[PDB]
Structures are given as C-alpha cells and as structure tokens.
Amino acid sequence: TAMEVVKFVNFLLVNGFQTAIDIFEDRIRGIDIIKWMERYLRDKTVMIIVAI
C-alpha cells in the first residue's frame, strides 16, 4: 500500500490533519524508531489508521 498510502496522506494533510507516518517523519523517527512509535501508541488522543 506504500503507493496508495502516500495519496491517502496527501488527502489527510490537505484537509488539515497532522498525520504522522514513518516516511514523512523520517528524521525524528531515525533518532529512536521505537520511541517514535511509542509516542503515538501511548497517546490516547491520537487516532490510528490501519491500512489493510
């Protein structure tokens, strides 16, 4: 889905949602991948989208 996920992220960003995805937060994610994932996993207010 990597191809369609980029279009989906464009759709979300253009409509005003701050979408966190590995390919775009590459710099921060690089510092600590697991910490980066945990930041969003622990936060209850962050909506998670599962691309099946």
């Binding site: 980029v6 992220v9 464009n10 960003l13 253009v14 409509n15 005003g16 775009f24």
Partner: protein, 48 residues
Amino acid sequence: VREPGSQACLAIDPLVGEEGGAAVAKLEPHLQPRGQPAPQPLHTLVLA
C-alpha cells in the same frame, strides 16, 4: 334497558406534531479539492 347516550365509548387520535417537525440533516465535508491547485508531497531526488 339503559342507553349509551351519556356513557358512549371514546375513540382516540394523537395530535401529531409532524407538520411542524424538523428534518434530519446530512453532513458533507467540503473537501479541499486537488482539482484546485492543492499542494503535493515533495518527493526529493539527489543529483550526484
């Protein structure tokens, strides 16, 4: 014998307020169109 004149049965009918009822409303988000010049992701390449 007795006459039902005074004791006649009663029918019932609600006073429906449908004539003045509000309608159900559907919401649609006004998508920021990509047909209009919306931004795009800046996939970068390197000229080495």
